[PDB]
Amino acid sequence: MKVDWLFKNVTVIDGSGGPQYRADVAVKGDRIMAIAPALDVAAEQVIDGQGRVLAPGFIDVHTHDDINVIRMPEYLPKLSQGVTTVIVGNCGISAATATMRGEVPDPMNLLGEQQHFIYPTVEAYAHAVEAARPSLNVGTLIGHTALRNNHMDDLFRPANETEIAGMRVQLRDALRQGALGLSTGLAYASAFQSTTEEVMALAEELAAGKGVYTTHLRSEFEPILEALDEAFRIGRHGNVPVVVSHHKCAGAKNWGRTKETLAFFDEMRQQQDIACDCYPYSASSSTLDMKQVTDEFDIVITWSEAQPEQAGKTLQQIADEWQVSLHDAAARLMPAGAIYHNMDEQDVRRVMRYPVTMIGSDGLPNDPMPHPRLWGAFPRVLGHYSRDEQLFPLTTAVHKMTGLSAARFQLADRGLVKIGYFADLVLFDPQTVRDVASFSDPKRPADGIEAVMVNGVMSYGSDKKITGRAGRFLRRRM
Ligand code: NI
Ligand code: NI
């Protein structure tokens, strides 16, 4: 009878995108018990949340935390932002159902070394999450490139009918055990030689609401309308939902072309169900590539094993200090990590203002000197873009990382502050919330986040310390 938590006088932004209101919210166990203008109830712990916003736990729909949630259960980078659930297994790479008979193909090395791929079924990955006891919930997609490596000798050829038939059966068993859908990373060499027909066969397993098709497009540059026209056809072939992962118009030539892609979205969202996600930044973070070296935008060096002295400077500054060309300056700096300012700020804002666009950090945890999105992708939307820049009301901003995300991936009883739903909550100050992570100082906790609750367990406070490990493995709504 005595509730566990009572949030008094909080501005409730329920994550539905609807109007905000002030009320009391009571939690008993892992469920939201009561919501009323006031609650004269006895509680074990009470919090006066006046002037604060009580919102659903933030859902990071685009992560690569397949292995990291297990060896770092207290996932401070996401929890300090207010993330209570991560969707892993994006871009065709996933640790679930992955089997390694030889070497690790690209880009599955982002998840971890061979030694960590020990999850041949979704059930085996689920129990490993439960054993690790993480601080946040974990749901997984199935990586197409991982399914290829389980059934093909070489990944640089079109798959035969027998190999594709085996992938459909393994994907079917994964979806029955709680997988959220299928992810593809077609731009990578391990899946570039795949026909659209092969992806169509796998996407058919997602019919009748058995998953969502998230896609790293085959090209995010000039032929992006081609790759989008693909992506929509595979969804139209099996009548399955499509989510364009980290939608961006990379390359100086494609700057401003979001007016063309989002228009292609509008025309095709009148025939099928389409969505997308993106991180609120106009700069990339990857390895220093010779084919990516250019003068059209800044290329800041994060780390450089060859020349560790030249760090934090643009490639043009390094090339001028050495009095050598750009391609030769990079050649002597490689291998290195670089920040590619290859995106236009107006393009990011258009994608963010798009109604069916979700917020995905796409953070790289194992990456030494990581992109600041790993520590402040979600507070950046709530603070800089919603409050300061006024891109959208705070209700819409919260909706793009909660209810819209939970409904898209069919997360049962999550993403909403509602009676009977799970008690994944975050209490933040709407006037001071901001991303503190910068490109020079990325691994830094955010401000304004005052409380984070996972399944009714208070897991993170304003002292920047993790106090709970009540994360669970989430299975698709059945
Ligand atoms: Ni990707
Ligand atoms: Ni990704």
Here the tokens at position 189 are 């060499």
CA 48 to chain centre: 32
Q: How many residues does the chain have?
A: 478
What is the 94 CA–ligand 2 centroid distance (Å)? 10
Would you put residue 193 in left (φ > 0), alpha (ψ -120 to 50) or beta?
A: alpha
The contacts of residue 122 (CB under 8 Å, 6+ apart) are 96, 97, 140, 142, 173, 174, 177, 178, 179
Residue type, 422: F
Around Cβ 85, how many Cβ atoms within 10 Å? 29
Q: How far is CA 477 from CA 78, 175, 296, in A?
A: 24, 10, 46
What is the 167 CA–ligand 1 centroid distance (Å)? 21
Residue type, 477: R
**One-character DSSP codes across 39-84:** ----EEEEEE-TT-EEEEPEEESS---TTHHHH-SS-HHHHTTTEE
Let me know: does 11 contact 21? Beta carbons within 8 Å.
Answer: yes
**One-character DSSP codes across 420-448:** TSB--EEEE-TTT-B----SSS-S---BS
DSSP state, 103?
Answer: P
Pairing verdict, β 21-28 and 449-454: unpaired
Nearest to 44 by CA among 56, 57, 33, 36: 33
Resolution in A: 2.6
List the determination method. Answer: X-ray
Pairing verdict, β 31-36 and 21-28: antiparallel
What are the domain boundaries of the chain? 57-282+343-412, 284-341
Ligand nearest to the CA of 217: 1
What is the 332 CA–ligand 2 centroid distance (Å)? 29
Would you put residue 119 in left (φ > 0), alpha (ψ -120 to 50) or beta?
A: beta
Ligand nearest to the CA of 364: 2
What is the 183 CA–ligand 1 centroid distance (Å)? 9
The helix or strand, by DSSP H or E, that contains position 36, with its residue range, turns out to be strand 31-36
Nearest to 336 by CA among 371, 306, 373: 306
CA–CA dist 114, 128 (Å, integer): 16
What is the 435 CA–ligand 2 centroid distance (Å)? 21
Look at the domain 57-282+343-412 and name its fold.
Answer: TIM Barrel (3.20.20)
Nearest to 53 by CA among 450, 457, 459, 377: 450
Long-range Cβ pairs for the range 251-256 (8 Å, 24+): 251/221, 251/222, 251/342, 252/294, 252/296, 252/297, 252/342, 253/221, 253/222, 254/221, 254/222, 254/224, 255/343, 255/344, 255/347, 256/344, 256/346, 256/347
Ligand nearest to the CA of 66: 2
Q: How far is CA 438 from CA 358, 376, 450, 455, in A?
A: 22, 9, 21, 31
What is the 435 CA–ligand 1 centroid distance (Å)? 23
Pairing verdict, β 3-12 and 137-140: unpaired
| 183: β partners | 143, 214
What is the 246 CA–ligand 2 centroid distance (Å)? 7
Query: In 3-state terms, what secondary structure has residue 38?
Result: coil
What is the 65 CA–ligand 1 centroid distance (Å)? 13
CA–CA dist 151, 162 (Å, integer): 9
Q: How far is CA 347 from CA 58, 137, 275, 343, in A?
A: 24, 31, 17, 7
What is the 142 CA–ligand 1 centroid distance (Å)? 14
Around Cβ 252, how many Cβ atoms within 10 Å? 14
What is the 26 CA–ligand 2 centroid distance (Å)? 36
What is the 185 CA–ligand 1 centroid distance (Å)? 6
Three-state SS letters, 252-277: HHHCCCHHHHHHHHHHHCCCCCEEEE
What is the 219 CA–ligand 2 centroid distance (Å)? 14
Let me know: does 208 contact 174? Beta carbons within 8 Å.
Answer: no
Nearest to 102 by CA among 52, 154, 55: 154
Here the tokens at position 415 are 């993403």
What is the 91 CA–ligand 1 centroid distance (Å)? 5
What is the 409 CA–ligand 1 centroid distance (Å)? 18
What is the 370 CA–ligand 2 centroid distance (Å)? 14
Here the tokens at position 202 are 């796998």
Domain 284-341 superfamily per CATH:
D-aminoacylase. Domain 3 (3.30.1490.130)
What is the 245 CA–ligand 1 centroid distance (Å)? 7
Here the tokens at position 210 are 């058995």
What is the 464 CA–ligand 1 centroid distance (Å)? 30
Nearest to 7 by CA among 48, 44, 52: 48
Three-state SS letters, 118-163: CECCHHHHHHHHHHHCCCCEEEECEEHHHHHHHHCCCCCCCCCHHH
CA–CA dist 200, 237 (Å, integer): 7
Here the tokens at position 214 are 């998230």
Ligand nearest to the CA of 244: 1
What is the 246 CA–ligand 1 centroid distance (Å)? 7
Q: How far is CA 141 from CA 50, 261, 414, 473, in A?
A: 38, 25, 17, 12
CA–CA dist 366, 374 (Å, integer): 11
What is the 360 CA–ligand 2 centroid distance (Å)? 9
Ligand nearest to the CA of 360: 2
